[model samples]
Target: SGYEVHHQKLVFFAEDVGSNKGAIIGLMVGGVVIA
Candidate 1:
């Protein structure tokens, strides 16, 4: 009685370790990237 329908999604997450003591290559999705 109707056409087939499908749903899809994508997820991006970032977690800070709090005690980070080292040079990090800042990178992220859907945002600014600072090297």
Candidate 2:
């Protein structure tokens, strides 16, 4: 169904969202984690 295809899109979108947060956390916490 269409829902299955859309589910994959959401997964990609979530990865970007996680990376955005990860960048913020890395900057605030320290470059240690990011490195």
Give me the candidate number with maximum lDDT: 1
What tens digits encode model 2's per-residue C-alpha lDDT throughout 1-35?
Answer: 35543333433354355355535442355444544
TM-score of each: 0.30, 0.12
Question: What RMSD does model 1 have?
Answer: 10.0
Instruction: Score residue 17 of candidate 2 by CA lDDT.
Output: 54
For candidate 2, the TM-score is: 0.12
The candidate 1 region of ten consecutive residues with least summed lDDT is 12-21
Span of 10 residues, lowest total lDDT, candidate 2: 5-14
lDDT (CA) for every model shown? 0.73, 0.43
lDDT tens string, model 1, 1-35? Answer: 88998999997767755556687876667976586
| Pairs with steric clashes in candidate 1 | none
